[PDB]
């Protein structure tokens, strides 16, 4: 809802299979440090149990 | 200052838009200043019936009935019928410049003491406009200073003119003031259809509270409309009518049909208009010569309202109001129908009334009413069934523990 | 008097009348409205605008040898006197006018009876229902492949 990203839905039989279109306005950020770690902040893959 | 605005506008006018296409206002503490680039005043010679010989600027500005406006009434295209207007400004203020320069000289006219002091000089010089720049006299009127309320009234009148001739630049202490109809139109309502034409500009918008209206006659703010409003919106309305009668089946009067509108409407290039008196206020010119002068398709402001819902359907749904409202049958889709009172589905006992040991059973169903005709004592044992589902009890009124069926 | 179908009224100032209307009939409306509209506001609850309850009526005055009229008409159709002189001099006490139209249940009944509809109208409830009557929902609740629309089996 922000406009920065869309999804579509493909599920598959083992595990998910949701596939992402970028759009023009993101970071869109470099060096696999960065971009990573903003796909760990914006799609949050690191989850934190206790 | 209408008077002075005008006779620059009407200087602006006399010469189809080549002089005085520049009026600067400045009107701050008691003094007025107003200049344009028109021809101004002659230094040609005009005569008096007394005899005396009067030069040109201070005969327009000091004596009435004096004016280049008496002419034939089917050439004229000027607002202007009485030759006593800047008389009527000198008359009441108490310091009064005022400069005309003709391309060859400058006729300085000063005017103090409510005419009994009046002086015009002639000064050589290269100018080429008028300018009048006067104090006004507060032991006649009934204000001592000028407030801001008249100068938002001038600033939004610069506005308007500005809007109906784009040709003349008009600045206000110093400040331009662009004109245009759209913008004009969508500082009234957002939805104000606008449609113009070679000499027309008229815009449709709405009225919650009553009725408005800004028209225009040339030069003149016809705050009382006249003969030309009259003849296009009955134009309108014989087309709107007949359509919204065609439309949703309402013979909507038509007062209550023209109640519901703004309308914006500048004309201009107008011929032989005629006002009922000095005040200027409404036209009295006759409705054949004004019917042939405009050529305003009308019928396309009734079909580009007709469509539009968002002035249409507030007067449709005001009818709805009066009698929509008043087609009255009072449901709220539930199960429609007849509004029984008491439902044939009922077990009474003999003792339904006195003191007695009796019950009532509040049971489930026919089944259990099956049950209970089958077990219970006609005397002591009474009972009802429930029809079905109960919603929330206290979400609903008490008069609605009334409209229910099965709690009634 | 009253009047279902349009504005009617009748003036004449001294004995000339006004077909068209003045300044004295705005009088006339201000101080009969100022002590009618709060009275009817606090009798039945209900807020009908001044145009709605003055085109409901007409108005007969007739005023007999006032001081200083003005007319900007040559047919003398629009008294353009002063509020000053006008209010100086009708000195028509509006507050009985008000308190006799308020006793008076020929006009105000059937609008009465029109808001009873809304206004103090008894509570319905019950099933309202909602006829939404559908909707696209394209994306919603279905499978979409990645050949939608290619041609494909
Ligand atoms: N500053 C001025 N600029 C141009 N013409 C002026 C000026 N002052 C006076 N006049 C002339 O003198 C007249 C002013 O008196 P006025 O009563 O305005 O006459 P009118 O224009 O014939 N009538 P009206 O505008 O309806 O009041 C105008 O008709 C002009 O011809």
Redesign the pocket.
């Known amino acids: 809802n922000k406009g920065f990203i869309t999804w579509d839905d493909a599920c598959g039989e083992h595990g998910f299979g949701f596939k992402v279109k970028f759009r023009k306005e993101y970071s869109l950020s470099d060096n696999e440090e960065e971009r990573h770690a903003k796909i760990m902040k914006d799609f949050g893959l690191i989850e934190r149990r206790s | 200052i209408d008077?002075?605005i005008?006779?620059?506008v009407?200087?602006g006018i006399r010469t189809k838009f080549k002089f005085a296409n520049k009026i600067n206002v400045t009107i701050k503490n008691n003094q007025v200043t107003v200049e344009?680039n028109?021809r101004?005043?002659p230094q040609a010679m005009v005569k008096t019936p007394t005899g005396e010989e009067i030069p040109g600027?201070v005969a327009?500005?000091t004596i009435?009935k004096?004016?280049?406006?008496?002419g034939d009434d089917k050439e004229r295209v000027?607002?202007?019928?009485?030759?006593?207007?800047?008389?009527?400004?000198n008359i009441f203020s108490v310091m009064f410049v005022?400069e005309?320069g003709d391309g060859q000289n400058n006729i300085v006219v000063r005017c103090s003491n409510g005419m009994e002091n009046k002086s015009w000089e002639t000064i050589p010089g290269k100018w080429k406009g008028?300018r009048?720049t006067f104090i006004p006299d507060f032991m006649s009127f009934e204000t001592n200073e000028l407030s801001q309320v008249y100068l938002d009234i001038t600033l939004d009148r610069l506005q308007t003119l500005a809007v109906v001739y784009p040709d003349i630049q008009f600045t206000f202490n110093g400040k331009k003031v662009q004109g245009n109809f759209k913008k004009y139109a969508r500082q009234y309502d957002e939805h104000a259809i606008v449609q113009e034409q070679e000499n027309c500009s008229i815009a449709v918008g709405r009225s919650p509270d009553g009725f408005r209206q800004l028209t225009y006659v040339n030069n003149?703010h016809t705050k009382n409309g006249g003969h030309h409003i009259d003849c296009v919106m009955d134009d309108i309305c014989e087309d709107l009518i007949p359509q919204i009668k065609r439309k949703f089946k309402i013979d909507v009067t038509k007062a209550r049909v023209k109640e519901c509108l703004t309308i914006v409407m500048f004309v201009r290039d107008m011929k032989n208009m005629r006002?009922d008196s000095?005040t200027?206020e409404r036209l009295t010119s006759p409705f054949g010569e004004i019917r042939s002068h405009i050529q305003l398709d009308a019928k396309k402001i009734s079909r580009a309202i007709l469509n539009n819902e968002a002035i249409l359907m507030p007067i449709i749904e005001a009818a709805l109001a009066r009698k929509l409202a008043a087609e009255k049958a009072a449901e709220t889709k539930a199960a429609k129908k007849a509004s029984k009172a008491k439902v044939h589905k009922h077990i009474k006992a003999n003792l339904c009334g006195k003191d007695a040991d009796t019950t009532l059973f509040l049971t489930e169903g026919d089944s259990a009413i099956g049950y209970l005709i089958d077990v219970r004592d006609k005397e002591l044992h009474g009972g009802y069934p429930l029809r079905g589902k109960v919603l929330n009890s206290w979400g609903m009124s008490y008069a609605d523990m009334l409209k229910n069926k099965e709690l009634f």
């Open positions: 008077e002075i005008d006779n620059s009407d200087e344009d028109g101004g005043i600027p327009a500005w009435p004096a004016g280049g406006n008496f000027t607002g202007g019928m009485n030759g006593v207007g800047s008389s009527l400004t005022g005309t008028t009048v003149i006002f000095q200027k």
